[PDB]
Design a protein around this nucleic acid. Structure first.
Ligand SMILES: [Mg+2]
Lengths: 586, 1325, 49
DNA sequence: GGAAGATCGAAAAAAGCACACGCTGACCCGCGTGGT
DNA sequence: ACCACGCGGGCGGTAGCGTGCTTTTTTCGATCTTCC
RNA sequence: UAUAUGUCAGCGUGU
């Protein structure tokens, strides 16, 4: 039909060229020439050539490049035949049927909203005004501010005061679907309650970022507006952020503090052996908060406070127990946001990432879902606030280099020089000499890392009653490493110890390791050596995406039609599961 | 040392310790020098257009007793200047006129001489000319042709790593790759058979190509094998023995000679027995007949008595065969020395498998392999074989190809014929066989010594040669059949193919691309780029892993960290700072020669191949002022590996510490403290920073900013020294010194700065003067600052007071907290210029007129339009406003439809420029006349300034002449100067001198009038456009984009983020002095992403700002210049044995005051890429000011006023604003336009469109229940038109219910399938 | 968007989808090689009905 | 002991190569040939 | 005698579409070997 | 909601 192969108007009298129209014109011309040749009783050669050329034209129309060279148009390129526009990634099946562009949708960059709740997101006023235009029109017509659709359009274009109130009314409980561009798994699109904000960037809850695999480095997100009541109810009940708390892949939780909440809770829940207002007795957590805010006590002061903890009996009733507990001011303050059903043992320790995750798991197991959500929101708020209050910072003096690094390096160099002398003497051949050199350098790196960790973990010494005492260090780098916020043993080792051995692009280990810290200066040779591994990793990451996407598409296709359609087969068959062991490990 | 005038204004403090021995070369030379090898006249050719002309010409006429020859070529002067071509949109190009000579010889005489010669000069198209900045001007746009990293022509020996055979056996192959011709391949079969392939076709036995070379079987065995002679004498079966031939083989019989049993049967021959054999020098060893049966005869043996051959060449011997040959009367036989490992019988097996037996059979087989359809013919096969590899026109191994071919085969000569030869193929086969045996090793494909760089000149020459052969075919066709009596050389050729080919190459190519204009660094990086893609190169999808790796040969030639991140990683690289190309195109790097343990200052440029032989010491090698390394063991690199070496074994040393990084990577301070991935991210992100309206120098730099700014053409560099005669915001006039004045010259240089010109990335290009009136200048001194430049130094971002601390989760992952003071000061505000074009064409019904009268528009809309129908300059137009009024004739069936250009929805700005291009023959409107008038006014102003200075000089001369005789100087000033000319003196030589001066003045006036007339003619010349279009009107809109949440900012150390909140000033943390911080950054990014360089830069910037604050405080107290001199000298003298020495004693008091005024905002510090400041130096600089050495101060919370419990790292960091603006990234649509075929919402933000709900989102919805949501996304919101209407009506009516309906995409698919012979339908049963 | 049309070919023409989509339906049903099909179809040789 | 079925290996062909977004360039034309 | 439809559109060359991807399917030519 | 007229290539950005 002509409308499926339209002639798109252009500037002036020009018209857009369509490959199908050219193919049809060529076929028609060939057919007409063949008809006029047959009517004129042309010789056999001419009619045979005309028939062959008509067959070739029909073949090109049906499938251009299937046989021979594809017919090219005015653009020096093969034309798009009927088969070319139905198959492939750009065909109708994969471009306009399985996926398609939708209305009531927008796209914008994402910033961080710390004040938002787990079920809320920040939507700019302009985006919400554009997306919810028909709802605003309907509400304006119902309330009588406008009499026709044109009047409502003019009023929303002029952005009158009543328009903002209408927009606030229509988005009270209307969920919006936020989705990131790579939708790897189910949690890539989630429903949130919109909150009107200024600015031009969508505000996203931090706790869901790990679910979205999204960072605030320039990432963008798309928003969709459900229309019918059924879609809104599915968004509220199935795709809401609060409903998605466990990963469908393995059942692990997906809402965990990542960077600043963990650091804040770790700093707040810590003890100093000699701090301000140590050893005093407090009536409760409220007194501890009052003392900390008034400046009369420190957040790490070891005190005794009266804690009332509620526990669930067999019948499920909450029974209170009040007792004096030896704790810190920060732990007592944090106890305020803990719900009643939880015990005090969760907060009476240095709260790292694992500790916070375990406390959230216990809260979910004991109480339920809504108390868990409220607890998570309160945890995020408290962590952010006390991380801001702490004022932790990283400086060039925080990466302490051990004084024994030079001695260890010199000993390793002496050992490898002795090995080289032995090789020159001829007692040891190249392969075993290389192996011994690698082993010596690995041992030296391990010794340097151990010495640096020993120096860093307990560097701080505190004078208690005139006596020196060793305590866990308050170094910012060490605090970040220990709390689990960011960084690991390997990265801290690279920062404060030697970088260790490096590998060639083929995989062979280089004899001379990088004995320079990141705090110190890496010379040209060491940087060039590290660039091999850096480029190898970056190239692997760049090339992995296409293979991963193809595999995911194939798996989705092969398992697209499998759904649960029954309750019980009654089958007595099954598979026998045993622990997996291969000669040393379970 | 001494400092230039522009450098003395603000001297950057340099912390570099290692003295520099070689200055940084010109960055764009690689782009320029190559073009200098393409258009320059070459007396011996081998380069440029001369090489192509000599390769094509002379041209025969199929033995037509006539030809045409090429004499010389000349490039004419371009019609328009570079600025003129940019303004008018034409291509900056120059004509090429070639001298041709058609010679016709006498007929009927094969040896007859010339009967006629016709010489002429013919124009053969216009070729583009590269500007002074290494860029081309094509269609008014600046394009850059990046260099291509490809595989050098020659022979390469490789082998699969035991993969295809699936048995661990390596199949060696050798590939001959010509510049032009057919690729040749030799491969080893798993059964140890040599096969030959041409153009990757079906394999054939290798001996076929030898037979086709007129080689007999005996000759082949002689060439590829060693002969062992067996001679029967006195019934003992003796043979000539070479001891080495019996190494590693078990003795089947007893080896006894001269009565001594050397070896007995059953025991393998040992090396000691071989040594004893050569001690006794035995040549005849008794051999039993059983040993013969395992030998292959070498040459044919034919019985003389019977006349028939007993045995041919190359087959296994047998007992009957040896008996027959023994009884035939032959006493001598020759066999092939075949060993199990040293000398395999590959050639013999290949001959056995070879079906051909003669040269003609081999030629027939080759022809039937190449062209199976055509039956073989003797002449056809001969011609095909000759044209395959032995034809100059068809096959051409380049000079570099021949050099590599000879080098790989260990040939002393490096020159030879382009075509192949029998000796070359024989040597290649022998080397491949030796490699298979074990001698030698395969080549490295990714080795930088086997990879060539093709620049603009080489590709341009290749395209010109292609066009030359294209026109030569037609020239031959026309000349052979036409009449030779009246054949002018001009009409025989056609410039159309040459022009089309050159335009196709320069305009539409994979390597000729739009030049990035985000910043000068972007242009520098783009010009110095090497891409492995393009024609005759790798592809993005099929690149692989090995190509993208960092080869050890990349040291000093290719930057390891500067490369795009994404699909094209490792395929696009940046040239190193000191890297340069050889004569053959291979990359080479400088080194300093070490002789007798001292490091000399002589510089040798070593290539990748030749640098492996020597031992190159590391750049970071400590010297003792005597050129001797202090350490006994120096870490050097000998053969692609780093190891310790004795101090006397070194041969070369690195010229500089920046030799390993590129220009972009060398601009990052403290790069050695940053991770390689983070350094790569920072280097990539640096060239994406949009310029700001105010340029701010980097407080912490590397000292390479000056070179980058000067080398790029953004800034205005004085051509000659002098004084600033006239300064202005738009132009500068410099009165040059008399030393540099040319004879008969006015003596003024005029620089016209570009003011608010749209760039290729819709950014603002603005030049601001940096000199004052009367200020002396010198050659090479910057007169105006281009975009992102500050006093001749590159300035990408701004210095922000940053504090590293978490702040209420507003910098949670990567977010950035920005104070309101940054917004108020307009520091990060950018200017974006967008061009909108409206063209009036000539339709079939009628032309399109651009008039101010438009139907169905109100008077308010036409208020902004002028009488000519074009928007006024300076008018502020919002979205939907009308800019240019145009009417298009309606159908035949008012009669005019509105096709006026309108501002796109959501786009605002101020009209700053309107450009009208009118085709010749079309009457110009008022706006075009006004533009031409203003251009003529500017040209007349310049010419009038020149005429005024020249006339003043001439009038001074005439006054001096007249005063000598007249002596009326007291009254001469009373009358005006013109009346001096009409005054006459008494009759002597003075009157003649006055007449000569008057006629010179008249001639000067006439010449200036002629120049003005020529400029007016050039200005008023009609513009050339595409056929069918009459007029073009372009309107430029300028928008000031301010910073806001969602905008993407970054640093130089790979740290990036988006603004999360614009907090009020009072909420920012403040120090004891109450100064708030500007930016708050999350410390959590530092540990995981290992970039301590940003922390060190923060500390150094804090120290620099402390020094600047001290200088400002001393300036505000009106202190004497002595205190300022002492303090600045103390600041500059800080450090440990730094190479930079600044003596303020030589500086004048005014110069010291100017330097202090420049430094009052902070002292710039130069930190080299690998020779930067140490921690101790930073602490000393911090102690110089009143700042703590720890780098952390005490901060108070703005909101609560409570001191933070721990010190926080505060300082000054250079932050950049990337070209990712949130307001340019928004989009929102409820309902809009729909597509035609699919009836789906459109795509993109320029046209109102919706987001794409792709396959992954559909799968995610299917993972949930989401049935109704998916149905409404697939039908109601996208395709179902009735569903769309009903849903909209229901929502307006307050009912949230939908009707699914039938999507139109499925109907379109059904019709598409039905268009074929396949019937598809829906069944209602 | 729905109404279609037809073109009356002067001579019969083979369908490529049933021609060069392996296995060749014409060749498989006629039990004779695909190259023979291509040769007889594109007017280069004769075949006996 | 020779025709026919089974096997091996090289060659030719076909199909595949993640998602989202942004920008620019082209959407004539040149021979040729009968109609006039 | 000049000109407007028209049509197919490939460069280069005694044609054939190749030079740095991987996997699967089909086809044919050479070799073997089974057996009546 | 139906508005004024969108299709192909090449290049680039973020996962
Ligand atoms: Mg990101």
């Amino acid at each position: 039909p002509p409308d499926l192969r339209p002639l798109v108007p252009l500037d002036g009298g020009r018209f857009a060229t369509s490959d199908l129209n050219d193919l049809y014109r060529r076929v028609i011309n060939r057919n007409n020439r063949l008809k006029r040749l047959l009517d004129l009783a042309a010789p056999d050669i001419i009619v045979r050539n005309e028939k062959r050329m008509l067959q070739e034209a029909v073949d090109a129309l049906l499938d251009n490049g299937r046989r021979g060279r594809a017919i090219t148009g005015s653009n020096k390129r093969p034309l798009k035949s009927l088969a070319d526009m139905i198959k492939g990634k750009q065909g109708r099946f994969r471009q306009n049927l399985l996926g398609k562009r939708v209305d009531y949708s927008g796209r914008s960059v994402i910033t961080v909203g710390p004040y938002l709740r787990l079920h809320q997101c920040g939507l700019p006023k302009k985006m919400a005004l554009e997306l919810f235009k028909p709802f605003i029109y309907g509400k304006l017509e119902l309330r009588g501010l406008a009499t026709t659709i044109k009047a409502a359009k003019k009023m929303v274009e002029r952005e009158e005061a009543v328009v903002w109130d209408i927009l606030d009314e229509v988005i009270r409980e209307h969920p919006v679907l936020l989705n990131r561009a790579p939708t790897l798994h189910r949690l890539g699109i989630q429903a949130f309650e919109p909150v009107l904000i200024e600015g031009k960037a969508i505000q996203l809850h931090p706790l869901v970022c790990a679910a979205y695999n999204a960072d605030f480095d320039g990432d963008q997100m798309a928003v969709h507006v459900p229309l019918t009541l059924e879609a809104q109810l599915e968004a509220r009940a199935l795709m809401m952020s609060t409903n998605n708390i466990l990963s469908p892949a393995n059942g692990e939780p997906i809402i965990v503090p990542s960077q600043d909440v963990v650091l804040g809770l770790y700093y707040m829940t810590r003890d100093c052996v000699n701090a301000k207002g140590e050893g005093m007795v407090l009536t409760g957590p409220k007194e501890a908060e009052r003392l900390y805010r008034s400046g009369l006590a420190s957040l790490h002061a070891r005190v005794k406070v009266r804690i009332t903890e509620y526990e669930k009996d067999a019948n499920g009733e909450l029974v209170a127990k009040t007792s004096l507990k030896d704790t810190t001011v920060g732990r007592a303050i944090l106890w305020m946001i803990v719900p009643k059903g939880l015990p005090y043992s969760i907060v009476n320790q240095a709260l790292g990432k694992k500790a916070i995750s375990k406390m959230l798991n216990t809260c979910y197991r004991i109480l339920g879902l809504k108390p868990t959500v409220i607890f998570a929101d309160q945890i995020m708020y408290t962590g952010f606030a006390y991380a801001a209050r702490s004022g932790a910072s990283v400086g060039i003096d925080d990466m302490v280099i051990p004084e024994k690094k030079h001695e260890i390096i010199s000993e390793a160099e002496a050992e490898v020089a002795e090995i080289q002398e032995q090789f020159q003497s001829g007692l040891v051949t190249a392969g075993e000499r290389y192996n011994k050199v690698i082993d010596i350098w690995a041992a030296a790196n391990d010794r340097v890392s151990k010495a640096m960790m020993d120096n860093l973990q307990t560097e701080t010494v505190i004078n208690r009653d005139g006596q020196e005492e060793k305590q866990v260090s308050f170094n910012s780098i060490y605090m970040m490493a220990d709390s689990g916020a960011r960084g690991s043993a390997a990265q801290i080792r690279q920062l404060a110890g030697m970088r260790g051995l490096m590998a060639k692009p083929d995989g062979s280990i280089i004899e001379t390791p990088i004995t320079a810290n990141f705090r110190e200066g890496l010379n040209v040779l060491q940087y060039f050596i590290s660039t091999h591994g850096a480029r190898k990793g970056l190239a692997d990451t760049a090339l992995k995406t296409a293979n991963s996407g193809y595999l995911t598409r194939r798996l989705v296709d092969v398992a697209q039609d499998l759904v649960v359609t029954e309750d019980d087969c009654g089958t007595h068959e099954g598979i026998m599961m045993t622990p997996v062991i291969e000669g040393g490990d379970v | 040392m001494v400092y230039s005038y522009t450098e003395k204004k603000r001297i950057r403090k340099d912390f570099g310790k290692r003295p520099q021995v070689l200055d940084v070369p010109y960055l764009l030379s690689i782009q320029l020098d190559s073009f200098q090898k393409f258009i320059e006249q070459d007396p011996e050719g081998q380069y440029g257009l001369e090489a192509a002309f000599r390769s094509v010409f002379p041209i025969q006429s199929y033995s037509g007793n006539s030809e045409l020859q090429y004499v010389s070529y000349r490039l004419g002067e371009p019609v328009f200047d570079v600025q003129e071509c940019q303004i008018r949109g034409v291509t900056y190009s120059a004509p090429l006129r070639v001298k041709l000579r058609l010679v016709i010889y006498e007929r009927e005489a094969p040896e007859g001489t010339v009967k006629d010669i016709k010489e002429q000069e013919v124009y053969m198209g216009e070729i583009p000319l590269m500007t002074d900045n290494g860029t081309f001007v094509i269609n008014g746009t600046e394009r850059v042709i990046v260099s291509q990293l490809h595989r050098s022509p020659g022979v390469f020996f490789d082998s699969d790593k035991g993969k295809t055979h699936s048995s661990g056996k390596v199949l060696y192959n050798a590939r001959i790759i010509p510049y032009r011709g057919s690729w040749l391949d030799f491969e080893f079969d798993p059964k140890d058979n040599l096969f030959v392939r041409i153009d990757r076709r079906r394999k054939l036995p290798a001996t076929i190509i030898l037979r086709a070379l007129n080689y007999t079987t005996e000759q082949i065995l002689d060439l590829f094998f060693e002969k062992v002679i067996f001679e029967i004498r006195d019934n003992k079966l003796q043979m000539e023995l070479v001891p080495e031939r019996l190494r590693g083989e078990t003795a089947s019989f007893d080896i006894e000679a001269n009565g001594k049993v050397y070896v007995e049967k059953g025991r393998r021959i040992t090396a000691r027995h071989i040594r004893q054999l050569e001690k006794d020098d035995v040549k005849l060893i008794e051999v039993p007949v059983e040993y013969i049966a395992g030998k292959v005869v070498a040459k044919d043996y034919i019985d003389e008595s019977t006349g028939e051959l007993i045995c041919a060449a190359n087959m296994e011997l047998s007992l009957d065969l040896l008996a027959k040959l023994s009884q035939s009367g032959h006493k001598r036989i020759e066999t092939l020395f075949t060993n199990d490992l040293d000398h395999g019988p590959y050639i013999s097996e290949t001959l056995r498998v070879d079906p051909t037996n003669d040269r003609l059979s081999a030629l027939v087989e080759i022809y039937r392999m190449m062209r199976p359809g055509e039956p073989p013919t003797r002449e056809a096969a001969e011609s095909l074989f000759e044209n395959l590899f032995f034809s100059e026109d068809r096959y051409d191994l380049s000079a570099v190809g021949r050099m590599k071919f000879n080098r790989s085969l260990l040939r002393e000569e490096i020159e030879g014929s382009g075509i192949l030869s029998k000796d070359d193929i024989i040597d290649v086969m022998k080397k491949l066989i030796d490699i298979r045996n074990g001698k030698g090793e395969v080549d490295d494909i990714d080795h930088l010594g086997n990879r060539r760089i093709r620049s603009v000149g080489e590709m341009a020459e290749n395209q010109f040669r292609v066009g030359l052969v294209r026109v030569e075919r037609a020239v031959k066709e026309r000349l052979s059949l036409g009449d030779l009596d009246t054949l002018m050389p001009q009409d025989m050729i056609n410039a159309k193919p040459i022009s089309a080919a050159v335009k196709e190459f320069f305009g539409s190519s994979q390597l000729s691309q739009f030049m990035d204009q985000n910043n000068p660094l972007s242009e520098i990086t783009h010009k110095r780029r090497i891409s492995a893609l393009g024609p005759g190169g790798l592809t993005r999808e099929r690149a692989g892993f090995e190509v993208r790796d960092v080869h050890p040969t990349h040291y000093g030639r290719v930057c390891p960290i500067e490369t795009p991140e994404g699909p094209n990683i490792g395929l696009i690289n940046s040239l190193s700072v000191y890297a340069q190309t050889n004569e053959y195109g291979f990359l080479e790097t400088p080194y300093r020669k070490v002789t007798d343990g001292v490091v000399t200052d002589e510089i040798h440029y070593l290539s990748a191949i030749e640098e492996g032989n020597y031992v190159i010491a590391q750049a970071n090698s400590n010297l003792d002022e005597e050129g001797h390394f202090v350490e006994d063991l120096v870490t050097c690199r000998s053969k692609g590996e780093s190891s310790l070496f004795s101090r006397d074994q070194v041969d070369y040393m690195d010229v500089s510490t920046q030799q390993v990084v590129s220009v972009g990577a060398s601009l990052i301070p403290f790069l050695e403290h940053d991770d390689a991935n983070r350094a790569l991210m920072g280097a990539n992100m640096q060239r994406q920073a949009v310029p700001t309206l105010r340029a701010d120098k980097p407080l912490v730099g590397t000292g390479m900013e000056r070179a980058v700014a000067v080398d790029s053409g953004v800034t205005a560099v004085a051509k000659r020294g002098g004084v600033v005669q006239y300064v202005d915001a738009s132009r500068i006039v410099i009165k040059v010194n008399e030393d540099e004045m040319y004879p008969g010259e006015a003596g003024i240089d005029i620089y016209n700065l570009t003011k608010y010109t749209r760039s290729n990335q819709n950014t603002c290009i603005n030049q601001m003067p940096c000199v004052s009136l009367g200020e002396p200048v010198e050659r090479g001194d910057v007169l105006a600052d281009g975009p992102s430049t500050d006093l001749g130094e590159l300035a990408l971002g701004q210095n922000m007071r940053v504090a590293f601390m978490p702040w209420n989760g507003y910098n949670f992952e990567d977010s950035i907290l920005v104070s309101e003071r940054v917004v108020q000061e307009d520091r990060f505000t950018t200017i974006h210029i967008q061009e909108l074009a409206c063209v009036s064409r000539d339709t079939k019904l009628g032309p399109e007129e651009i008039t101010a009268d438009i139907p169905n528009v109100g008077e308010a809309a036409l208020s902004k339009l002028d009488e000519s129908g074009i928007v006024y300059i300076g008018a502020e137009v919002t979205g939907g406003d009308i800019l240019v009024g145009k009417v298009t004739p309606k159908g035949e069936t008012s009669d005019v439809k509105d096709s006026s250009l309108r501002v796109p929805n959501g786009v605002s700005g101020t009209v700053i420029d309107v450009q009208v291009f009118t085709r010749d023959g079309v009457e110009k409107d008022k706006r075009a006349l006004e533009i031409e008038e203003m251009q003529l006014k500017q040209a007349k102003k310049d010419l009038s300034e020149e005429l005024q200075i020249l006339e003043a000089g001439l009038f001074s001369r005439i006054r001096a002449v007249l005063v000598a005789g007249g002596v009326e100087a007291e009254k001469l000033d009373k009358l005006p100067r013109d009346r001096w000319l009409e005054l006459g003196l008494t009759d002597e030589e003075k009157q003649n001198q006055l007449e000569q001066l008057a006629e010179q003045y008249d001639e000067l006036k006439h010449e200036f009038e002629k120049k003005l007339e020529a400029k007016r003619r050039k200005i008023t010349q009609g513009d050339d456009l595409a056929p069918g279009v009459l007029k073009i009107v372009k309107v430029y809109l300028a928008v000031k984009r301010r910073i806001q949440p969602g905008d993407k900012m970054a640093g130089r150390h790979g740290n990036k983020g988006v603004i999360s909140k614009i907090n009020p000033i009072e909420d920012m943390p403040y120090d004891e002095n109450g100064t708030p911080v500007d930016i708050v950054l999350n410390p959590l990014g530092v540990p995981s992403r290992m970039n301590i360089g940003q922390i060190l830069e923060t500390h150094l910037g804090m120290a620099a700002k402390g020094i600047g604050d001290k200088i400002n405080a001393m300036l505000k107290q009106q202190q004497e210049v002595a205190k300022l001199r002492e303090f600045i000298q103390r600041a500059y003298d800080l450090g440990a044995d730094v190479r930079q020495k600044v003596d303020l004693s030589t500086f004048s008091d005014e110069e010291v005051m100017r330097l202090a005024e420049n430094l009052r905002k902070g002292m710039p510090i130069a930190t080299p890429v690998f020779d930067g400041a140490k921690e101790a130096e930073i602490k000393e600089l911090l102690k110089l000011g009143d700042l703590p050495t720890s780098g952390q101060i005490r901060l108070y919370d703005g909101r609560t006023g409570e001191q933070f419990e721990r010190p926080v790292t505060v300082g000054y960091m250079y932050m950049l604003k990337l070209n990712h603006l949130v307001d340019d990234k928004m989009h929102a649509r409820s309902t809009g336009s729909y597509s035609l075929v699919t009836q789906q919402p459109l795509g993109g933000k320029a046209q109102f469109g919706g987001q794409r709900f792709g396959e992954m989102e559909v799968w995610a919805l299917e993972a949930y229940g989401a049935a109704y949501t998916l149905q409404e996304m697939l039908t109601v919101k996208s395709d179902d038109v009735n569903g769309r209407t009903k849903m909209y009506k229901n929502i307006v009516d307050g009912n949230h219910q939908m009707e699914p309906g039938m999507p139109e995409s499925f109907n379109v698919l059904l019709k598409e399938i039905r268009s074929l012979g396949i019937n598809i339908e829906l069944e209602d049963e | 968007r729905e109404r279609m049309g037809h073109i009356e070919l002067a001579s019969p023409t083979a369908h490529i989808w049933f021609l060069k989509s392996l296995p060749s339906r014409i060749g498989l049903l006629l039990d004779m090689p695909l190259r023979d099909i291509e040769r007889v179809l594109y007017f280069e040789s004769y075949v006996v009905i």
